[PDB]
Structure 1
Amino acid sequence: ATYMEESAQSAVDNFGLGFNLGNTLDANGCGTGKPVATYETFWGQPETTQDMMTFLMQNGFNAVRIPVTWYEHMDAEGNVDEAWMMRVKAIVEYAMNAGLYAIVNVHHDTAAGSGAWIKADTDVYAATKEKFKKLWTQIANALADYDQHLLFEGYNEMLDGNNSWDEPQKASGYEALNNYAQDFVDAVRATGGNNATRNLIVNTYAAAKGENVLNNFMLPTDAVNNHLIVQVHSYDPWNFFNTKTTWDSECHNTLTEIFSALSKKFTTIPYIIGEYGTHGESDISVSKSSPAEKIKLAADQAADMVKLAKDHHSATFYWMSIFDGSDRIQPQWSLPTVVEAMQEAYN
C-alpha cells in the first residue's frame, strides 16, 4: 500500500493555488435517469477530461475542488446511480493522476435551489439524517482506495428552512448543522481503510463567517487527530465587482479583517477559503469580455486573497472564472492576467 497519512495542516499547506470545477458535476435540474453527460453539461460546461486536470497541475495549481450534486442520482431508497458514481470516480482519478489534491463534496443538495434536502433545521435533520449518512457511506466506500490527496467535504452551503444567508433565524439551526457535521465524520470514519485517517472538511453555516456563525460553529469530535479542516467562502467585499472601480484600501482591509477573524477563531485547526471570486448581486461576475479595468479588479482581488491565505496558513479555491467553458477544452486560461497575478502572489 502507498497511502501516507498527512495532517490537516500539512494538506492545506500543500494545496497551493486551488480551483473549483464549478457548474459541472454540481449542475442539476434536468430530472432523473438522464445520461451522465447530460448532467455534466447541463449548465454550459464541457465534459471534464484528464487534460484539464493536467493543465491545472502544469500551470501552478495543486488542488481542485470538485463540487457534486447528488439528489437527481439517488433513487427512493437513497442509493446512488452506479453510472453517476463511476463518473465522479473518473473525474477524481483525473485529479489523482495529475498529482493534484482534490475535494469531493455534497453541493446543491444544500441551499436555496429546488431539490435541496439538507438544511440547518431540526425537522429537516430528523427526516434526512439516515439518508445523509447512507449517502456519505456510499461516497466513502466508492472513493475508499484513493490516497491522502483526496479529501471529502460533508456539505456545501447549508441554510435553514428560510434560506437565511447570514444566520439561521432560530438557534436550533446551528445544532442541526453541527449534527450533520458529526454524522458525516462518523459515517466516513466507520468505513475504515484510508477513510479512517483521511482529511475531512466541514463547512460553517451558509459557508459564512459572521460573528454568530463562527461562535456557534463546533468542530465534530474525531477519534484520530489533526484530520479536520473548516471551510468558508469569500466573495468579499460583497458586490464589490459592481460597486468598486479599483481594489483599494477598503477592499484590502475587508480581506485582512476576515483572515484575522478566522485565524482568531480557529487556532489548532486549519481553515480554507473553498470558493472566492467576483460573483455578486444577481451573480454578476467577471469574464474575458469585461472592461480591462474590471479584469484588473478581479486580478487584484485574487492576488490579495492568495497572499493573505498564504500568510495565515490557509488555502484558496477560485470559483470558476479563470478556467471556464470552451476554454477548458483547449485547454487555456479564461483570465490569464488574473492567474498570473495569483501565481506571482503565491510564489
Structure 2
Amino acid sequence: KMKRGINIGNALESPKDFPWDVKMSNKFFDDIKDAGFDTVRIPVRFSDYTSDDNFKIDEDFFKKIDKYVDYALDKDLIVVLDLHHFEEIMKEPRVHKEKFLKIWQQIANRYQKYDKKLVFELLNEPKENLYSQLLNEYIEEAIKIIRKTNPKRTIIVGPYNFYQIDYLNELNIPKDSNIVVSFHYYEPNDFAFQGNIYHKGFEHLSNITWEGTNEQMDYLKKRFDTVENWANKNNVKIFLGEFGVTKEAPETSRRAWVKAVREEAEKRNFSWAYWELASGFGIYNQIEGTWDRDILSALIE
C-alpha cells in the first residue's frame, strides 16, 4: 500500500507558542492526492500540549488533529501520525518515559476505530540520551499499550541517532507482524542540508554539488545495501520516512540527488516519504498550490 509519500513538515511539529512557516490546510491533502502520492506523513509535537498530572493532550489541539486526519483519510490517503520533536525525552528519557506512554495511550484510544490507512509512528529520530537499550524498552511498552485497542494498526519504529542506518543493528524488532521499520537518509549531510536554518551547523554552507558520480552512486547503493540486508534478515518492510534537499542547493544536483535516492528506495521495495511539502525543503507552493515540476518529476514519473 505505502509507496509514494510526502511530509507536511514545519507545521504541527512546531513548538506550541512559536508556529513555523507552514500552516496546515486541508487543500494540501487534495493536492498531495492529485499529484500521485499515496501516503502523507504528519509530524505532530504532542509533547508540547500535555498536562505537565496524567499528561492529558490539549483537547482543543487534539480536535485539530482530528480535523486534518479525518480529511486526509477521507481522500483515501495513508496517514502516518508521527510523534515528532519530543525533545525532553531525548535529554532525560527516564524522567519522561511515563509521559511518552500516556501520550500514546490517548492516541491509541482516541483513534482505535479509525481506518487501517491511519498509521502510528512512535517517536521520530531518537537521539542523545535515549540510547538503544532504553529506546527498545520504551518501544516495547508503547506497542503493548497500543495493541490493547489497535491489535493490527501498522506501527512504525526507527533506530537510534536520528533514524540512522548505522544503528539498525541495535533496534530490537518487536515480535509483531504489523510493524514497519523506518530510516531517514540525508547523505551527504552538507549537500542535503546546505543553507537551512533549522539545521544546526549547516546554515552557512553554500553551492555544494551532487553530480551523481560513480563513487557518489556507489556510496548511496552501499548504504541502502546495509538496510536491505538488515531488513532481509529480520523480515520487515522498510519505510524511508524522510529524505530531501534544501531549496538553496544547486537545481540540477537537487533533482539528481532526489531522483537517485527515490529510485534506490523503490528498487529495493522501500516505501518512501519526501522530506517536506512547502518549507525550506519544499517542492510545493502553499500560496498558489503549484508543484515544482523539476523535483516532482524526480519523485513521481
1:11 aligned partner: none
Name the amino acid aligned to 1:204.
Answer: P
1:227 aligned partner: 178
Q: 2:296 aligns with which of 339, 343, 347?
A: 339
Q: Number of residues paired by the alignment?
A: 282
Give identity over the alignment, percent.
Answer: 25
Aligned-residue offset at 1:15: 1.9
Q: Conserved in 1, the CA contact under 8 Å of 2:238 and 2:270?
A: yes
1:150 aligned partner: 118
Three-state SS of the structure 2 residue aligned to 1:66 is strand
Instruction: Return 5+ residue gaps in structure 1 as ranges.
Output: 1-13, 31-38, 110-115, 162-167, 279-284
Aligned-residue offset at 1:50: 2.2
Aligned-residue offset at 1:248: 2.4
Instruction: Return 5+ residue gaps in structure 2 as ranges.
Output: 193-206
2:142 aligned partner: 184
Provide closer, same or farther for how the CA distance between residues 44 and 326 of structure 1 changes in structure 2, counting only shifts above 3 A: farther
2:241 aligned partner: 274
Name the amino acid aligned to 2:9.
Answer: G
Name the amino acid aligned to 1:216.
Answer: E
Q: Conserved in 2, the CA contact under 8 Å of 1:299 and 1:337?
A: yes
1:23 maps onto 2:10 in alignment: yes
What CA distance in whole angstroms lies between the structure 2 residues aligned with 1:326 and 1:337? 11
What CA distance in whole angstroms lies between the structure 2 residues aligned with 1:73 and 1:64? 22
What CA distance in whole angstroms lies between the structure 2 residues aligned with 1:144 and 1:251? 44
Q: Conserved in 1, the CA contact under 8 Å of 2:210 and 2:253?
A: yes
Q: Conserved in 2, the CA contact under 8 Å of 1:299 and 1:342?
A: no
Aligned-residue offset at 1:128: 2.2
1:4 aligned partner: none
Q: Conserved in 1, the CA contact under 8 Å of 2:7 and 2:274?
A: yes
1:88 aligned partner: 65
Aligned-residue offset at 1:22: 0.3
Three-state SS of the structure 1 residue aligned to 2:156 is strand
Report 1:257-272 matches (<5 A).
Answer: 257-267=222-232, 268-272=235-239
Aligned-residue offset at 1:237: 2.0
Provide closer, same or farther for how the CA distance between residues 343 and 322 of structure 1 changes in structure 2, counting only shifts above 3 A: farther
1:9 aligned partner: none
1:74 aligned partner: 50
Name the amino acid aligned to 2:49.
Answer: H
CA deviations on 1:43-91 (whole Å, 9 max, x unpaired) are 1112x22221011111111101000002221112210000111111111
What CA distance in whole angstroms lies between the structure 2 residues aligned with 1:250 and 1:320? 27
Aligned-residue offset at 1:337: 0.5
2:201 aligned partner: none
TM-score normalized by the length of structure 2: 0.87
Q: Conserved in 2, the CA contact under 8 Å of 1:63 and 1:102?
A: yes
Aligned-residue offset at 1:304: 1.4
CA deviations on 1:212-254 (whole Å, 9 max, x unpaired) are x1221111233xxx20011110011221255325232233222
CA deviations on 1:265-303 (whole Å, 9 max, x unpaired) are 11210111110112xxxxxx225xx6xxx1221111121
Provide closer, same or farther for how the CA distance between residues 209 and 159 of structure 1 changes in structure 2, counting only shifts above 3 A: closer
CA RMSD after TM alignment: 2.1
Q: 1:286 aligns with which of 247, 255, 258?
A: 247
Q: Conserved in 1, the CA contact under 8 Å of 2:44 and 2:81?
A: yes
CA deviations on 1:159-217 (whole Å, 9 max, x unpaired) are 123xxxxxx8xxxx321010111122111112x2xx11001000110234354x12211
What CA distance in whole angstroms lies between the structure 2 residues aligned with 1:176 and 1:286? 36
CA deviations on 1:279-331 (whole Å, 9 max, x unpaired) are xxxxxx225xx6xxx12211111211221111111111111156749822431
TM-score normalized by the length of structure 1: 0.76
Q: Conserved in 1, the CA contact under 8 Å of 2:42 and 2:80?
A: yes
Q: 1:203 aligns with which of 148, 151, 158?
A: 158
1:303 maps onto 2:259 in alignment: yes
What CA distance in whole angstroms lies between the structure 2 residues aligned with 1:196 and 1:216? 25
Three-state SS of the structure 1 residue aligned to 2:61 is helix
Three-state SS of the structure 1 residue aligned to 2:40 is strand
1:136 aligned partner: 104
What CA distance in whole angstroms lies between the structure 1 residues aligned with 2:277 and 2:190? 16
What CA distance in whole angstroms lies between the structure 2 residues aligned with 1:237 and 1:303? 15
Three-state SS of the structure 2 residue aligned to 1:67 is strand
2:128 aligned partner: 160
Q: Conserved in 1, the CA contact under 8 Å of 2:6 and 2:277?
A: no
2:74 aligned partner: 97
Aligned-residue offset at 1:92: 0.9
